[PDB]
User: Which sequence fits this backbone?
């Protein structure tokens, strides 16, 4: 008698040449983005019209502001504003001196070239019906603007005749695919340190708070499932102090 | 260590320690057989003036002799044998003493500790072998533990219900010399439980005594079911008399309970059970209250457990009677029969602690009416002798009973196992405690002679009679010469029926007289006794019975008496099978004649 | 003998005193009540906007508790969450006032719908305790009371370096347990402080900030309020068995 | 596959049928109240003969004498309680000597088990330490299966005792269902495909063994009882001994396996073995152990056992080869170099082809014959007007019995008489020496003689017994008459326990502690049992008595008064190696004879 | 409790038991329509990539 057979996979192995050839090929590109964005922090006296006065100044001088958020500290008549700019140091420093000179502000700090904890908040509603349904759902709302009918039939019929479209799947399999997608998204947001705050028959809402470079990656990974609705904040920050060991700080070779 | 340390044994070898420990434990006699692995011990007890020594021809004799010593003296029987074959030959006495509750401390030799589990010469797992048939056993791993284990052995063998213990003694342990101070005082785990629950237990037993006395005073047809437990105390029998006289309670005894009650007393129900009298059996069945004192409800006693004591059982369901059990071990409480009142501890102690609670009674006319009616209607009947007939076995016991009694001596009776054992229990009048020594629990053949020898050592000036059977005697007859060497003037009576009577009785009754290998070839006992160095007397004719019995007892020194008795005579009454105690099979002169002619027909005249 | 053990002997309530406690502690309102309204604006991301909506709401003296401009992942489309308070007809005027603006697609009212309101808060929070915090505040407030503060038992001064070390981590744990219970996290730990992070309801954010308040809050920053409606679903058996028609 | 030929039979009746199936022709037993259903079934059974002893221990010892003389299992049918505990010693004895035996003990009903019943003993729990395997038959359905398992285990691998407990209700029960009789042994179920890999291992072990034998220059065949458990055992041992010219020394239980009238015979090894064999072992470069387990009575001081063998092993030119049936006894005492698992006889045939024939071992046998003609079994022979010497009695009888032309079987007790009957008796035939060696039980001689006489009714069974040993079980003297066994009992009466007294005279300053029992009148005793009693106490009376003794047509007892306090020599005791023996010297004995009289006050 | 549990599904386990059962039962090629039935099952490893 023979032992129960097993189809051996035999996963192929790298050699020294193809491995290096792979790593070199998978190399990105240095300085694909220009000078790193600058972050400013305004300490503003909370008096009526400050939000219009600050943001109005940047718009009156054509400063390319990426984001501006006003935060309420736990101090009476004191607010904190976090601004993100782009441009050379000479232009952005001027922007700092232009805002700081305003009356209702105390001081505008420059957080660029400084160790800070950048944070951002996002809440997104994600579809559980899959890719095919998201193409159907999105194209449906586009016809409310495109004003086309006979030409769009080539698209919607092509979509609804796909294999994993809910219309072509039994009611039991759609249910599993909803929770399979749900488990994927839940595992995806948990790794990013997020939460699933809402679950429905057709969708779910995820909540995540991290740095902008972290959230954008998150929204790119969740994107294929279909983002039905998204709310992404600006950017706030809190300064951090880089701790170093007593042996590392003892290296005061300033000779 | 914090306990006491003794230095009296420093410088002594393991064997020389053993010699001292015998005097420290008050040992008068040691029964044993020398051997290789036990040589260091024997070298140390050489001509020892601390105790005498009895040398058998077989180790099984040494064990049985030790049992006879313990049953008669009340002291632990010490056995000193070697490893291997010497230790495997004392298994039967140990198993026998384990069931009848006889205090033994068996000292077996052992190969050196550096040879254990090497299939060594004369090596046996004596501890493992004797584990089930001993109260406790141990192998002494070092000289330091030797006096400790010995004290543990003697304490266990005498604590609670007495029994046999085994102490395995390696040669290198008994040969090595002690060099360091050692602990000696015992600390048994069982004593740690009693010390923690002393006040609670001592009050619990008193509460049971109160409830017992209330039920006893309430009883109107009581029966004292007395066992061997009342004999394990000096003031045992006398408190039994006191309780029996105070409340006018009739007393029945087990086989091992015989001697604990004067059978000349009008309240004596005599022996009950399988071959017990009908009077005692019917009394137990009709009693409303059974007071079990030092008994364990053996299956040879209760007969059919389902039919056992119907009246006493229903009286318990009415709150007017039941069963009261005086036990020393909780193991034997509610094991065979359900007990309404359990009194734990020494029976004699508890009885003397209940006397002040028992209401005095002078007359039980209704209850003693049936008892005295049964005594006259159902006596120990048998086919008595006729002119020109073979000697009857029951008659010999009755005659020897009055002959031995008319000497004025202290008579001790040991028996073998079989029909002769029962007839010696039925037709012998027991009055004195520790005078009847028999193997009942295990029923070992070849017990008669060696037990008689050992009992004779305990009581040198006592008349020790061995009522043995021909088949039983042919188990350890080698000890006849041992009796001469030991200087024991034992009296051997062999009721020779040239058959295995007890087995033939069951074959005659339950197997249609198909006698299978129950007739052994007996030797000339008279020539045997003389070859061993004893006096031999044979009685063939009925007329010579009286004249020889007188000579048998009057003879100074060891003497063997063979009495050719009638064959194929069943012991009656008999409670066997699914029969209750009230369903006994009594004697019938016509039936025996019918069975006689039927036996000749099936056996072709051979029997 | 007796192994000694102090009897705490915990007292028990009766039917009367138990009620007397509940009656005494149960919350109560106050004079001139106030309720919260939430609006959601869908605007086009043209130059300005932020100054337009804020200006329109300030030029009419509305309450305005927060604004918070949120970015949708859609080209040239922003989203704002305005928190208001006042009579239902008053805040309705505000809604129609903003919707009239040309870059505003629509303004939705989320005050009467099951929504998810979240607010980000980042606090620094000292580890040195109340005594040091009283010292630090008075130091930047620019006598005799300074000496009394530094003469308190659990100030870092007149206290062994070992107990200060443990009190640092003791406070660090107590803060950590609070953040954990509220579903937050400690993102930074220094030798004197620990930056915490929390995203929850404003009514819960203020609750956390009040509980961690005694530890001494060095820095703080509350985002505002972001709102996203729950996907309409609450009951299973009352979906078609309402019979309200 | 269910048997149905026992349906309607009682457990006892099934037992009776199983005996014929197991080719049993003799049963040794004693009745009882729990084994009654079995005895009622075997009543007048024409399927096998019955032998009734006077003691159960006798039955056990008779079964061993039957087993060792016939090669068939000894069957014991005793009762419960004391009837079972009395067979413990012969079971422990058979467990040591590896004797095929199936002991059926009775038992109380299953309804009474665990209630401290009448005549109830934990026979399974007791005999567990001294049996290969025991079992309590739970139901009549399992009875034919258990009996089949018993006989198989008792005869497989190394033979030994097994115990089968038979409850009263079980043997009385009537079988009313089809039953399995096929055994399902776990150790036997291991052989699925492992048999191949193991069969290659033993064959390669043979190859390495055959190579080492051909390389040896001073080899010694160390032979035990394992070569006797096969019919072609003694035959193949001679074939190899002639082929490679290898000298043969045997253990006490190995006696009879090799012709001692052969020039290559080394006689007995061990404690009381001749110096020729001991020195041969101590100076051998290769030791070929065939059917022996290196007992402590044989190896002497284990530290000094065969230095030349170990030294040759470290140089890759010799060592110790072990032919053993059970791996349990391999590398247990001494570290072997080559292990040949399995039947010794079977493997000797497979190796015989790979052995290079040797013409002669000149310098090796020259040194052996030197020892052989320098260290005989010397002892203080008789002088004019002296007492009869025990060694001389063995000498004369060894020739008288040989002159009969009859097949002679010799059984002994335990002690000095046992050793002298092994040294001075010349052994040539297999299965003719039956003695208790492993456990050394006294009172073994007489019952084993009776049992062997049953196995071989034509043979001249002679019991060379001692006075102390005979007193152990002389009750079976009457059993010999009833069994119709014309056994010949020889008692070397020195009126002492010689083997113990010797150790007391040598190591305990002649302090004889309770080693002198009171013997009966052996001649009056013998005739009381139904035998003929013969006694000789004079030298010129011995030869005539030894002939009347043997030529007696029936059971007979001959007591020979022998000299007292005569030590068995040579003797390897204490920390002495086999080469550090203590040989006989006329002056040494003559001095201690004078030293003893002073220390004992002329008493001994 | 400690148990080693297969991950190849029921089909392989049903196959595994049959292989070790025919190694102790008989040396003959019995149960041919069992090994052939257990194999060629839909979710037996030998039929899956
Ligand atoms: C052939 C034959 C036939 C027999 N037939 C009968 C028969 O018909 N009738 C009969 O009675 N026997 C008969 N026997 C014996 C029977 O099998 C038992 O051995 C007998 O019942 C034992 O008596 P016992 O139980 O009273 O004593 P034991 O068996 O010794 O029991 C003693 C009990 O009392 C307890 N005990 C011990 N010491 C003390 C103490 N100091 N204080 C308190 N409690 C203690 C013990 O724990 C134990 O439970 C027969 C024996 C043989 C061989
Ligand atoms: C007083 C006294 C003194 C003694 N002194 C001596 C002495 O001086 N010299 C001496 O030799 N003995 C002596 N003995 C006996 C000694 O104690 C042992 O019993 C003896 O060594 C046993 O011989 P044995 O080992 O060869 O056989 P066993 O003990 O029976 O061992 C046989 C070995 O071979 C194996 N075997 C069994 N059958 C087979 C088979 N078919 N195929 C392969 N292997 C098998 C077995 O597993 C076992 O390991 C004495 C005994 C007594 C009572
Ligand atoms: N469709 C749903 N309906 C109700 N509850 C849900 C739904 N989906 C998820 N939940 C649960 O709601 C939880 C989120 O509520 P959360 O813990 O944030 O309290 P909350 O902010 O006070 O919400 P709310 O103000 O509505 O009471 C999820 O963790 C999840 O356990
Ligand atoms: N004083 C500290 N310095 C550096 N790291 C710290 C310090 N204290 C804590 N950490 C670690 O930093 C972790 C913060 O992880 P986080 O997700 O914020 O990384 P991040 O968003 O990429 O920010 P950064 O770029 O500063 O590392 C803490 O969970 C903690 O494990
Ligand atoms: C009995 O020997 C042992 O217990 C024993 C067992 C295994 C290993 C070592 C020993 C101790 S011993 O070798 O020194 N022998 C001994 O003490 N006594 C001794 N007495 C004999 O005559 C009664 C005969 C005899 O063996 C032939 N041995
Ligand atoms: C031996 O009895 C049992 O094994 C036994 C043990 C406990 C409970 C029941 C039994 C079976 S039994 O009561 O029915 N007795 C029996 O079968 N035979 C029987 N034979 C006797 O004479 C040899 C004598 C005798 O006891 C006095 N018993
Ligand atoms: C060692 C042993 N084997 C078997 C028994 C079972 N048995 C009990 S009595 C008896 C027959 C003995 O009868 P006997 O000793 O002659 O006395 P009898 O009944 O003839 O008077 C037997 C074999 C036993 N008790 N002990
Ligand atoms: C049952 C038993 N007890 C003790 C021993 C230890 N032992 C061995 S030989 C012997 C003395 C026997 O001497 P004997 O049988 O007369 O033969 P002898 O040496 O005197 O010739 C003893 C007690 C034993 N082997 N078996
Ligand atoms: Mg009799
Ligand atoms: Mg909630
Ligand atoms: Mg002797």
Assistant:
């Amino acid at each position: 008698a023979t032992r129960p057979p097993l189809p051996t996979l035999d996963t192929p192995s790298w050699n020294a040449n193809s491995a290096v050839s792979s790593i070199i090929y998978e190399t990105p590109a240095p300085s694909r983005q220009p000078r790193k964005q600058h972050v400013l922090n305004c300490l503003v006296q909370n008096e009526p019209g400050v939000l219009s006065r600050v943001s109005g100044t940047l718009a009156a001088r054509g400063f390319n502001i990426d984001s501006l958020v006003v935060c309420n500290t736990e101090v009476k008549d004191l607010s904190r504003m976090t601004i993100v700019l782009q441009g050379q140091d000479g232009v952005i420093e001027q922007a700092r001196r232009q805002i700081e000179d305003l009356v209702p502000v105390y001081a505008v700090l420059d957080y660029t070239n400084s160790e800070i904890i950048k944070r951002e908040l996002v809440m997104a509603r994600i579809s559980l019906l899959g890719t095919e349904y998201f193409e159907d759902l999105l194209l449906h709302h586009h016809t409310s603007t495109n004003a086309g009918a006979a030409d769009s039939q080539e698209l919607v019929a092509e979509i609804r005749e796909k294999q994993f479209h809910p219309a072509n799947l039994p009611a039991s399999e759609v249910l599993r695919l909803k929770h399979e997608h749900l488990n994927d998204i839940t595992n995806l947001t948990n790794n990013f340190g997020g939460r699933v705050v809402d679950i429905s028959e057709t969708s779910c809402i995820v909540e995540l708070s991290a740095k902008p470079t972290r959230i954008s990656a998150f929204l790119k990974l969740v994107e294929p499932f279909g983002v039905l609705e998204c709310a992404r904040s600006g950017m706030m920050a809190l300064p951090r102090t880089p701790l170093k060991t007593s042996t590392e700080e003892a290296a005061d070779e300033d000779e | 260590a914090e306990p006491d340390m003794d230095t009296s044994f420093v410088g002594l070898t393991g064997g020389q320690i053993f010699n001292e420990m015998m005097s420290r434990q008050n040992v008068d006699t040691v029964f044993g057989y020398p051997g290789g692995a036990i040589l260091p011990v024997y070298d140390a007890i050489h001509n020892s003036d601390k105790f005498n020594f009895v040398l058998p021809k077989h180790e099984q004799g040494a064990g049985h002799m030790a049992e006879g010593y313990a049953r008669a003296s009340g002291k632990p029987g010490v056995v000193l044998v070697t490893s291997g074959p010497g230790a495997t030959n004392v298994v039967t006495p140990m198993a026998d003493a384990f069931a009848d509750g006889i205090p033994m401390v068996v000292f077996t030799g052992q190969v050196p500790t550096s040879a254990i589990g090497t299939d060594a010469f004369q090596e046996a797992d004596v501890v493992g072998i004797s584990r089930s048939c001993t109260k406790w056993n141990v192998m002494v791993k070092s000289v330091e533990e030797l006096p400790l284990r010995i004290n543990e052995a003697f304490e266990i063998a005498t604590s609670g219900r007495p029994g046999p213990v085994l102490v395995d003694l390696p040669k290198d342990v008994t040969a090595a010399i002690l060099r360091n101070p050692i602990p000696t005082k015992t600390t048994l785990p069982s004593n740690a439980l009693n010390q923690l629950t002393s006040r609670a237990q001592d009050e619990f037993v008193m509460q049971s005594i109160n409830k017992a006395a209330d039920l006893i005073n309430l009883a109107k047809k009581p029966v004292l079911y007395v066992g061997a437990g009342i004999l394990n105390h000096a003031d045992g029998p006398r408190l039994l008399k006191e309780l029996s006289d105070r409340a006018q309670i009739p007393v029945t005894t087990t086989l091992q309970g015989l001697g604990s009650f004067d059978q000349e007393d009008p309240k004596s129900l005599d022996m009950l059970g399988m071959h017990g009298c009908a009077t005692a059996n019917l009394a137990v069945q009709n009693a409303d209250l059974i007071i079990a004192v030092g008994a364990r409800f053996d299956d040879r006693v209760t007969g059919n457990i389902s039919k056992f004591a119907p009246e006493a059982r229903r009286a318990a369901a009415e709150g007017r009677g039941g069963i009261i059990h005086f036990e020393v071990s909780p193991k034997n409480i509610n094991k065979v029969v359900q007990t309404q009142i359990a009194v734990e501890g020494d029976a004699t102690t508890n009885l003397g602690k209940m006397m002040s609670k028992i209401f005095p009674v002078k007359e039980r006319s209704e209850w003693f009416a049936q008892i005295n009616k049964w005594k006259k209607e159902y006596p120990y009947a048998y086919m008595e002798e006729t002119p020109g007939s073979k000697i009857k076995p029951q008659t010999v016991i009755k005659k020897l009973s009055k002959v031995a009694n008319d000497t004025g001596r202290h008579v001790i009776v040991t028996t073998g196992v079989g029909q002769h054992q029962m007839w010696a229990a039925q037709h012998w009048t027991w009055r004195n405690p520790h005078t009847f020594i028999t193997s009942g629990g295990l029923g070992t053949m070849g017990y008669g002679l060696p037990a008689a020898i050992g009992a004779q050592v305990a009581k040198p000036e006592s008349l020790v009679i061995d009522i043995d059977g021909d088949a039983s005697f042919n188990m350890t007859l080698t000890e006849l010469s041992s009796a001469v060497q030991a200087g024991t003037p034992v009296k051997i009576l062999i009721l020779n029926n040239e058959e295995q009577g007890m087995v033939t009785q069951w074959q005659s009754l339950f197997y249609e007289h198909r006698y299978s290998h129950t007739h052994q070839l007996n030797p000339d006992f008279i020539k045997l006794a003389e070859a061993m160095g004893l006096k031999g007397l044979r009685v063939k004719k009925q007329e010579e019975l009286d004249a020889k019995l007188k000579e048998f007892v009057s003879t100074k020194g060891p003497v063997l008496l063979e009495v050719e008795v009638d064959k194929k005579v069943p012991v009656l009454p008999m409670v066997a099978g699914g029969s209750g105690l009230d369903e006994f099979i009594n004697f019938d002169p016509e039936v025996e004649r019918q069975q006689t002619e039927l036996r000749h027909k099936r056996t072709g005249g051979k029997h």
About this structure: Residues 198-218 of chain B form the longest helix (21 residues). Chain B has three domains: 1-190, 191-379, 380-607.
